[PDB]
Design an enzyme around this catalytic site. Structure first.
Site, PDB file in Angstrom:
ATOM      1  N   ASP A  17      61.213  25.719  68.365  1.00 49.92           N
ATOM      2  CA  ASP A  17      60.210  25.682  69.220  1.00 49.92           C
ATOM      3  C   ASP A  17      59.737  26.943  69.608  1.00 49.92           C
ATOM      4  OD1 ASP A  17      57.813  24.223  70.665  1.00 49.92           O
ATOM      5  OD2 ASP A  17      58.962  24.786  72.199  1.00 49.92           O
ATOM      6  N   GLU A  69     100.046  10.358  63.495  1.00 47.95           N
ATOM      7  CA  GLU A  69      99.777   9.918  64.762  1.00 47.95           C
ATOM      8  C   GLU A  69      99.044  10.856  65.795  1.00 47.95           C
ATOM      9  OE1 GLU A  69     102.705   9.317  63.176  1.00 47.95           O
ATOM     10  OE2 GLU A  69     102.512   7.061  63.106  1.00 47.95           O
ATOM     11  N   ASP A  85      59.052  18.157  71.295  1.00 45.78           N
ATOM     12  CA  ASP A  85      60.298  18.187  70.328  1.00 45.78           C
ATOM     13  C   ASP A  85      61.415  17.382  70.549  1.00 45.78           C
ATOM     14  OD1 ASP A  85      61.744  19.894  72.428  1.00 45.78           O
ATOM     15  OD2 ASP A  85      60.012  21.193  71.842  1.00 45.78           O
ATOM     16  N   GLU A 102     106.056  14.041  66.321  1.00 41.95           N
ATOM     17  CA  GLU A 102     104.424  13.788  65.981  1.00 41.95           C
ATOM     18  C   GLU A 102     103.951  13.992  67.281  1.00 41.95           C
ATOM     19  OE1 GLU A 102     102.552  12.197  62.950  1.00 41.95           O
ATOM     20  OE2 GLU A 102     104.213  13.613  62.517  1.00 41.95           O
ATOM     21  N   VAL A 148     101.677   3.179  56.203  1.00 44.68           N
ATOM     22  CA  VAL A 148     101.427   3.546  57.755  1.00 44.68           C
ATOM     23  C   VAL A 148     102.134   4.936  57.891  1.00 44.68           C
ATOM     24  CG1 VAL A 148     102.782   3.088  60.071  1.00 44.68           C
ATOM     25  CG2 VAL A 148     101.644   1.238  58.481  1.00 44.68           C
ATOM     26  N   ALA A 149     103.357   5.281  57.049  1.00 45.17           N
ATOM     27  CA  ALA A 149     104.051   6.825  57.389  1.00 45.17           C
ATOM     28  C   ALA A 149     102.852   7.634  56.874  1.00 45.17           C
ATOM     29  CB  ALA A 149     105.218   6.784  56.596  1.00 45.17           C
ATOM     30  N   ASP A 181      62.281  22.653  74.185  1.00 43.49           N
ATOM     31  CA  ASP A 181      62.231  22.527  75.538  1.00 43.49           C
ATOM     32  C   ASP A 181      61.426  21.239  76.080  1.00 43.49           C
ATOM     33  OD1 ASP A 181      60.098  24.234  75.163  1.00 43.49           O
ATOM     34  OD2 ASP A 181      59.748  24.407  77.516  1.00 43.49           O
ATOM     35  N   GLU A 237     109.019  13.713  57.118  1.00 44.95           N
ATOM     36  CA  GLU A 237     109.247  12.508  57.739  1.00 44.95           C
ATOM     37  C   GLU A 237     109.261  11.307  56.985  1.00 44.95           C
ATOM     38  OE1 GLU A 237     105.810  12.878  60.418  1.00 44.95           O
ATOM     39  OE2 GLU A 237     106.868  14.014  61.950  1.00 44.95           O
ATOM     40  N   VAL A 260      99.765   7.846  57.844  1.00 44.00           N
ATOM     41  CA  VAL A 260      98.925   8.221  58.737  1.00 44.00           C
ATOM     42  C   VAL A 260      99.390   9.068  59.895  1.00 44.00           C
ATOM     43  CG1 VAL A 260      97.505   7.024  60.736  1.00 44.00           C
ATOM     44  CG2 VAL A 260      97.801   5.806  58.292  1.00 44.00           C
TER      45      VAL A 260
END
Ligand SMILES: CCCCCCCC/C=C/CCCCCCCC(=O)OC[C@H](COP(=O)(O)OCC[N+](C)(C)C)OC(=O)CCCCCCC/C=C/CCCCCCCC
Ligand SMILES: CCCCCCCC/C=C\CCCCCCCC(=O)OC[C@H](COP(=O)(O)OCC[N+](C)(C)C)OC(=O)CCCCCCC/C=C/CCCCCCCC
Ligand SMILES: CCCCCCCC/C=C\CCCCCCCC(=O)OC[C@H](COP(=O)(O)OCC[N+](C)(C)C)OC(=O)CCCCCCC/C=C\CCCCCCCC
Ligand SMILES: CCCCCCCC/C=C\CCCCCCCC(=O)OC[C@H](COP(=O)(O)OCC[N+](C)(C)C)OC(=O)CCCCCCC/C=C\CCCCCCCC
Ligand SMILES: CCCCCCCC/C=C\CCCCCCCC(=O)O[C@H](COC(=O)CCCCCCC/C=C/CCCCCCCC)COP(=O)(O)OCC[N+](C)(C)C
Ligand SMILES: CC(C)CCC[C@@H](C)[C@H]1CC[C@H]2[C@@H]3CC=C4C[C@@H](O)CC[C@]4(C)[C@H]3CC[C@]12C
Ligand SMILES: CC(C)CCC[C@@H](C)[C@H]1CC[C@H]2[C@@H]3CC=C4C[C@@H](O)CC[C@]4(C)[C@H]3CC[C@]12C
Ligand SMILES: CNCC1=CC=C(OCC2=C(OCc3ccccc3)C=CCC2)CC1
Ligand SMILES: *[C@@H]1O[C@H](CO)[C@@H](O)[C@H](O)[C@H]1NC(C)=O
Ligand SMILES: *[C@@H]1O[C@H](CO)[C@@H](O)[C@H](O)[C@H]1NC(C)=O
Ligand SMILES: *[C@@H]1O[C@H](CO)[C@@H](O)[C@H](O)[C@H]1NC(C)=O
Ligand SMILES: [Mg+2]
Lengths: 983, 268
Positions: A335, A293, A680, A770, A288-289, A676, A745, A291
């Site tokens: 185009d 935030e 296309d 964070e 988890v750490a 346009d 951290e 990841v």
């Protein structure tokens, strides 16, 4: 099919009549077998589904998994009587809240973009005209049935797919459904094999520009050509954006590193003496750490800032991920009609005085004008101004002449606008020469004639002006006007005229001949009875005035935009449904075909050799028409694309545009499509980024596209390319900055678990780092200027140049993050020892330190501490680690401004947003430390001033180390230092 | 990706160089960290802490210490000696460090005021510490009653104040222990305590404490509170606070600062 079918073979298939029409009962019962003559509305995604899609993505899914792991670990700990279980709940809530708020922001961006786009969407019901059982009554178009006999006149929308039975001077505007810029004649004779190029089929969406026509409804609703294009576009799947792919790769890197660290320290915890459940909780905490935030919010805010910068240039993205695709784009499939060109016939070239002149065709008149100082020019201007029945709408003075609206032919409109631009007050000049006789442009004569009276009241002559086809005015016109003189034809002027006409025709332009005849007063006195049906005036022996040619010209900024895109290393391919000659001329005009580049046909014509005898690799340019494209298989298409750098596709169907886009993508390129029209829309959907013109674009094209150019400015493409490259680089810098602080951290937790020191950094202070103190500095890096000429670099290799790669990850995590961890631990041990806890005593202290039953724990001086006093000391440790990370992050944001340049070259203070963000970070740090109530609310303590000074040498070390690394990179390109230490 | 010539996108020679670079980087960083710790420890004072920010008022602990759910909780049975055998054993273990044999390293003090030592005149560059023996606790000292009053329903509780270097409780009068009910049982009288030493005071010559380096034999002065009217078969909450001028017991985030609070139940 129906075009290749006589009326005898019709009139029984649909049980109708060519004149009586469908019976009023058969039509009513056929409206039951086949639905109303209307296109099926699209699928339609509900708003909650849109928001749920915003709640997804690679980073979002990683955060969902992290929150789930937090809750599972909370349950495991609660099944063990653990105390510090609120950290899991706080982390899960923070992750979920960031995901939800970012999804809300993205959904609001989508909703606002949809509102702005639909603001310019025009709505109106549509009528028709049907003759059932003889009665020619007016009906709504959706009540039409296959087999109905309808009538069309100028200015009315074609009510359905119709096989034309009778037509008189009927022309149709097919520029949106096909690529044809010129008005197309509709006649009941089957001309071409396919229904898309025949003359006896009119299409559902198109405009009847002039004349009248009658025909049989042959297709209805979704079986029409536009309905089938809509069906084809619906089946096209929208693939992932390059930035989404980059984010997914970065998520994979995060997951791999998290699993590696978690498994390693799970083994370490097992070998140290922890129970299996505790080691599993430790593994989950580490995973988890890893990841981050706030990274999702930072990326979203940076993308939104780029979107705002683009919208400042009338370039609106429908999703935030589209702001980088143009920067990553290597192929632009463009185009022609309506995208590169103005979709408006204008005067381009003039052949008078034996010289071809060039007119200003830009809609803002920002080009050069031909030499108007002559007498042949004045005669030609008079002829083309008088021999014109078109007129501007009354009440037009603010609008520029190119964008005014006139009632008349397309060619007459072009001539009237040219006269208004050159002579000025064309209508007043024409009315100052009263017209006494006129002859419309009938098919037999193939010319328009009119006799006028001169403006001066002392010249009693009559001037006869005639405009028509070049090889219908040349059969007349015994004389030719050159330099004001009236030299006759000596076959040399005929040769020159033929050469000029051939050249103008080969330029893909429609040429018109103009001439005048000054009728004598002796033979034609004033008040002469001019009869159109008697031919009492001389229709031969005229004086040729000049040749005027018209084209659908490119938009003003298109050539420079194309040149800039090609300078940026982007291949530009023209793909149009228009005719090959016009397509090639426009491609040469806008720079898709460079000067001096030839096709195999050009080389063969220059070498007097057959087409099969020329080396294909000698030709830089290539024009492939739709019938050839049908026969070529993917291998030949790939070979042609890789052989000819400057490629033009003409007479290309929507399916073939999709095929070309798919081939370019399969070759590994990121493909942009600009269009346009409806033709296309499938290509726009298949493109990595689809760009549609806001004003000229059809609703299908604007729905298919990810980018809308509200002002129809093509230079916005180069703006988007530059902004995409800039946002790629700045996102790289911002992600490096964000990832750096994750290691300081996490390392305190690892030391807390393995060495059993009192917890150096808490969950709440980690959340503050964070989500509060570093988001603004990370976002401020989106304002960094380019470190080089970003528009002269080649497009990045999508498989080799990733947004986040191993050098960036390794640097940010294990060098700068390592220094930050060392600074934090130095401050931690300083604050511990100065309050009485020496490092050796701190080692292994966690059980006693956290024991609620120990109220007299002895420190290094023998002083006895209560649990509450030790907890306040722990909060002090939290605060000193937090402040160390903050100061090192100030140094980090300073060093992430550049990846190669020095800070002393890019400028310390030129990013005012960055300076303000640094001040903001320091101010919030001070507020958290020294606001009353913080120790018991957020566990921040009013730390002593020397705790601030301890990490400052480490921050300076970070700055100096990065400066030395970048100096080594600059001074030794291609060395080992450059290959390993550069990100 | 793992291949013989190129191992995870990098040849074996290049892996050697990048690993050597990271080893050198981390060696240098560890050396800088170790030098910082060395400098810190060389600026740290051996005898007096630099700051006492978390030690403003001393904590107060109780013996015997038995913790229930939310804090100290002592419950036993007069009719059942096995209920207070452990409590008396804890008290005996605690007072083992207060025998004259344990106190041979301290001196007799008769001053009744601050032992202010500015030099090191005890042996081994040490400051003197005063003796506290487990005879100053008279009845609650463990003799001639080895039950500390637990057997007869009048338990003795030893109250110890946490020691803080150079902290001074106040010299107007000796710091004094006062024990009372938190919320008095409305059916009974106020708590009747009688203390050892007399008046439940800590003599002022046990202060200041100079730390364990200067005073390796220092012993915290003890006060024994013998409770004499605790109702039987009933839960009571006892709060014992320190009455000194420089001791505070009003911190709501530390219930042991300046006082000690326990639940007590004596069944019969
Ligand atoms: C990044 C841009 C925004 C995108 C995301 C938006 C949402 C971000 C918010 C995330 C937080 C999740 C929602 C709240 C979850 C926790 C709720 C809560 O119950 O929390 C309580 C704690 C403190 O509780 P206590 O000790 O008093 O309770 C004592 C009770 N007992 C005794 C049991 C401990 O509070 C805490 O954990 C504080 C945790 C720290 C995070 C707070 C939110 C700060 C976000 C600032 C972003 C501002 C905009 C960005 C910067 C502007 C420039 C661009
Ligand atoms: C991936 C790379 C990881 C690198 C990890 C760090 C490697 C270095 C770690 C330890 C090496 C020893 C460093 C400390 C030694 C300093 C030099 C020294 O000789 O000092 C003397 C002290 C003992 O003095 P005293 O108190 O008896 O004197 C009292 C003096 N009077 C009485 C006057 C007050 O010796 C001591 O303290 C020894 C203390 C030993 C235990 C320290 C605590 C361990 C915690 C480590 C966490 C570090 C995390 C790093 C994060 C990196 C992330 C990449
Ligand atoms: C970048 C700038 C941001 C500015 C934010 C907007 C402005 C709001 C800021 C301040 C307004 C309130 C100021 C504080 C109230 C007056 C001071 C006060 O009443 O002091 C009474 C004392 C303070 O105690 P002490 O100072 O001796 O420390 C305690 C020491 N220890 C270890 C011993 C127990 O008694 C107490 O403890 C009770 C104190 C109770 C808490 C006071 C209310 C303020 C706390 C939180 C409000 C929201 C802050 C967070 C906002 C979202 C996150 C950014
Ligand atoms: C904070 C912690 C700092 C700790 C640092 C310890 C790490 C020691 C670094 C040793 C540097 C090694 C070096 O010098 O490698 C020389 C290479 C030579 O490559 P080549 O041309 O033979 O490769 C071409 C041939 N092929 C392509 C086959 C490869 O690279 C070059 O010469 C290109 C330029 C290299 C010289 C500038 C960078 C080297 C300096 C490193 C010291 C960094 C820290 C400075 C002190 C701390 C201040 C904060
Ligand atoms: C970039 C522009 C920045 C503009 C300024 C930002 C806002 C500053 C405003 C106010 C801060 C000062 C007022 C609060 C502190 C005094 C309150 C107090 O009383 O603190 C006292 C300590 O104070 C001091 O040692 C000195 C006061 C100043 C400390 C440092 C202030 C922070 C300044 C940082 C600037 C760094 C700039 C360079 C780095 C960045 C380079 C780009 C706390 O008491 P204690 O620990 O003894 O209690 C312990 C007992 N226990 C724990 C039970 C409560
Ligand atoms: C600290 C100890 C236990 C770690 C184990 C020792 C070995 C496995 C470590 C020490 C140095 C490390 C290398 C240091 C440098 C790099 C360059 C980076 O771009 C990829 C990782 C890589 C290649 C590391 C791989 C793992 C490594 C070789
Ligand atoms: C030995 C002690 C001092 C620690 C190790 C120092 C490290 C960082 C130094 C010492 C020797 C150095 C290597 C010597 C050989 C090479 C190969 C060359 O083509 C590029 C530089 C490179 C790749 C160097 C990288 C950095 C290096 C490995
Ligand atoms: C992007 N960095 C965010 C984080 C960095 C470092 C972290 O350490 C984990 C940690 C704690 O784990 C608790 C925890 C246990 C199990 C699962 C999830 C969480 C507790 C206190 C402090 C630190 C958590 C989060
Ligand atoms: C313990 O106290 C109870 C009353 O709560 C009493 O009945 C019992 O006799 C005591 N213990 C024993 C087994 O003597
Ligand atoms: C300390 O003083 C007391 C009372 O005067 C005395 O009985 C005791 O012997 C002295 N300390 C020793 C040597 O135990
Ligand atoms: C203390 O013991 C003495 C006998 O030595 C006795 O007289 C006195 O009452 C006891 N005090 C208490 C309350 O235990
Ligand atoms: Mg078009």
């Amino acid at each position: 099919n129906d075009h290749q079918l006589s009326v005898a073979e019709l009139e029984q298939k649909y049980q109708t009549s060519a004149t009586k029409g469908l019976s009023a009962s058969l039509a009513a019962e056929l409206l039951l077998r086949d639905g109303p003559n209307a296109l099926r509305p699209p699928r339609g995604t509900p708003e909650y589904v849109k928001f749920a899609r915003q709640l997804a993505g690679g980073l979002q899914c990683l955060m969902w998994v992290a929150a789930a792991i937090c809750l599972i670990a909370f349950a495991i700990q609660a099944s063990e009587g653990d105390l510090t279980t609120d950290d899991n709940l706080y982390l899960a809530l923070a992750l979920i809240a960031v995901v939800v708020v970012t999804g809300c922001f993205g959904y609001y961006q989508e909703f606002k973009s949809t509102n702005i786009i639909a603001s310019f969407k025009n709505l109106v019901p549509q009528q028709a005209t049907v003759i059932r059982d003889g009665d020619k009554f007016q009906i709504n178009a959706d009540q039409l049935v296959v087999g109905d006999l309808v009538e069309m006149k100028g200015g009315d929308r074609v009510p359905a797919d119709i096989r034309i039975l009778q037509a008189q001077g009927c022309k149709v505007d097919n520029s949106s459904l096909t690529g044809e810029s010129e008005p197309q004649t509709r006649s009941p004779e089957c001309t071409h094999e396919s229904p898309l190029e025949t003359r006896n089929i009119a299409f559902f969406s198109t405009m009847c520009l002039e004349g009248t026509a009658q025909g049989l409804v042959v297709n209805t609703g979704d079986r029409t050509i536009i309905g089938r294009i809509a069906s084809l576009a619906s089946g096209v799947e929208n693939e992932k954006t390059p930035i989404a792919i980059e984010i997914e790769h970065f998520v994979d890197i995060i997951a791999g590193l998290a699993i590696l660290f978690g498994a390693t320290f799970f083994i370490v915890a097992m070998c140290i003496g922890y129970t299996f459940l505790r080691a599993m909780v430790f593994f989950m905490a580490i995973v988890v750490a890893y990841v981050p935030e706030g990274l999702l919010a930072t990326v979203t805010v940076c993308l939104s800032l780029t979107a705002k910068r683009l919208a400042s240039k009338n370039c609106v993205v429908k999703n935030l991920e589209a702001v980088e695709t143009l920067g990553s784009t290597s192929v632009i499939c463009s185009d022609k009609t309506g995208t590169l060109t103005q979709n408006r016939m204008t005067v381009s070239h003039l052949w008078f005085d034996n010289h071809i002149h060039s007119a200003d065709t830009t809609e803002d008149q920002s080009g050069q004008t031909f030499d108007q100082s002559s007498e042949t020019w004045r005669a030609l201007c008079r002829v083309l101004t008088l021999c014109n029945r078109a007129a501007f709408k009354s009440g037009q003075d603010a609008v520029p002449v190119p964008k005014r609206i006139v009632i008349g032919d397309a060619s007459e409109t072009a001539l009237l606008k040219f006269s208004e631009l050159t002579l000025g007050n064309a209508m007043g000049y024409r009315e100052r020469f009263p017209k006494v006789c006129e002859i419309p442009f009938n098919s037999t004569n193939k010319f328009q004639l009119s006799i006028h009276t001169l403006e001066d009241p002392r010249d009693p002559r009559h001037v006869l002006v005639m405009k028509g086809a070049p090889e219908r005015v040349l059969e007349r016109c015994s004389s030719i006007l050159i330099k004001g003189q009236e030299l006759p034809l000596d076959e040399q002027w005929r040769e020159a005229f033929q050469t000029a006409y051939l050249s103008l025709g080969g330029l893909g332009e429609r040429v018109l001949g103009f001439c005048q005849l000054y009728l004598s007063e002796k033979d034609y006195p004033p008040g002469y009875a001019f009869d159109v049906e008697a031919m009492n005036f001389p229709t031969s022996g005229l004086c040729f005035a000049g040749l005027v040619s018209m084209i659908d010209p490119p938009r003003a900024t298109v050539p420079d935009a194309v040149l800039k895109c090609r300078t940026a290393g982007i291949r530009v391919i023209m793909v149009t449904g228009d005719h090959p000659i016009t397509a090639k001329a426009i491609a040469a005009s806008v720079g898709i075909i460079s000067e001096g580049s030839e096709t195999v046909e050009d080389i063969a014509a220059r070498l007097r050799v057959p087409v099969d005898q020329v080396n294909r690799k000698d030709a830089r340019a290539c024009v492939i028409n739709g019938m050839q494209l049908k026969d070529m298989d993917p291998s030949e298409l790939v070979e042609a694309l890789r052989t000819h750098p400057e490629m033009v596709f003409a007479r290309t169907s929507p399916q073939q545009k999709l095929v070309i886009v798919e081939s370019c993508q399969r070759l590994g390129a990121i493909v942009a499509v600009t269009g346009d029209g409806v033709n296309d829309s499938p290509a726009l959907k298949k493109a990595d980024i689809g760009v549609a013109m806001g004003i000229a674009g059809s609703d299908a094209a604007k729905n298919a596209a990810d980018m809308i150019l509200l002002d129809d400015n093509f230079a916005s493409i180069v703006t988007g390319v530059e902004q995409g490259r800039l946002i790629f680089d700045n996102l790289k810098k911002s992600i490096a900055y964000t990832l750096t602080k994750n290691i300081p951290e996490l390392t305190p937790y690892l030391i807390y678990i393995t060495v059993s020191v009192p917890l150096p950094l808490g969950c709440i202070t980690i959340l503050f780092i964070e989500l509060c103190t570093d988001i603004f500095p990370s976002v401020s890096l989106a304002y960094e200027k380019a470190e080089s000429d970003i528009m002269h670099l080649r497009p990045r290799n999508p498989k080799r140049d990733r947004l986040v790669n191993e050098p960036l990850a390794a640097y940010s995590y294990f060098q700068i993050g390592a220094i930050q961890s060392f600074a934090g631990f130095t401050d931690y041990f300083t604050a511990m020892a100065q309050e009485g806890w020496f490092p050796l005593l701190c080692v292994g202290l966690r059980p006693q330190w956290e024991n609620h039953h120990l109220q007299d724990l002895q420190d290094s001086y023998g002083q006895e501490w209560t649990f509450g006093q030790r907890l306040y000391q722990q909060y002090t440790c939290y605060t000193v680690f937090f402040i160390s990370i903050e100061m090192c992050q100030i140094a980090d944001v300073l060093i992430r401004k550049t990846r190669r340049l020095s800070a002393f070259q890019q400028g310390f203070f030129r990013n005012r947003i960055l300076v303000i963000a640094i001040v903001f970070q320091v101010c919030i740090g001070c507020f958290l430390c020294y606001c009353p109530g913080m120790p018991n609310i957020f566990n921040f303590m009013p730390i002593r001033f020397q705790w601030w000074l301890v990490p400052m040498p480490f921050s300076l070390l970070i700055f100096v180390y990065d400066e030395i690394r970048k100096l080594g990179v600059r001074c030794c390109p291609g060395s080992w230092w450059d290959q390993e230490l550069y990100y | 990706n793992p291949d013989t010539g190129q191992m995870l996108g990098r040849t074996l020679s290049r892996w050697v160089w990048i690993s050597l670079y990271y080893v050198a980087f981390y060696v240098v960083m560890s050396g800088i960290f170790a030098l910082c710790i060395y400098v810190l420890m060389r600026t740290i004072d051996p005898y007096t802490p630099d700051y006492q920010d978390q030690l403003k008022s001393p904590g107060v602990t109780l013996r015997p210490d038995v913790y229930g759910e939310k804090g100290l909780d002592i419950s036993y049975n007069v009719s059942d000696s096995t209920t207070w055998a452990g409590l008396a054993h804890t008290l005996h273990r605690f007072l083992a460090g207060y025998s004259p044999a344990a106190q041979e390293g301290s001196i007799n003090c008769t001053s009744e005021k601050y032992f202010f030592q500015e030099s090191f005149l005890a042996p081994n560059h040490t400051k003197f510490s005063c003796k506290f023996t487990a005879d100053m606790l008279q009845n609650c000292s463990g003799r001639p009653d080895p039950t500390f009053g637990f057997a007869e329903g009048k338990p003795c509780f030893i109250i110890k104040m946490n020691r803080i270097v150079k902290f001074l409780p106040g010299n107007s009068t000796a710091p004094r222990v006062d024990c009372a009910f938190l919320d008095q049982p409305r059916d009974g009288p106020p708590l009747q305590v009688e203390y050892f030493p007399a008046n439940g005071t800590y003599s002022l010559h046990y202060f200041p404490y100079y730390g364990k380096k200067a005073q390796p034999h220092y012993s915290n002065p003890l006060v024994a509170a013998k409770l004499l009217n605790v109702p039987r078969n009933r839960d009571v909450v006892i709060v014992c606070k320190i009455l000194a001028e420089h001791v505070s017991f009003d911190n709501p985030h530390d219930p042991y600062e300046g006082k000690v609070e326990f639940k007590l139940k004596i069944q019969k």
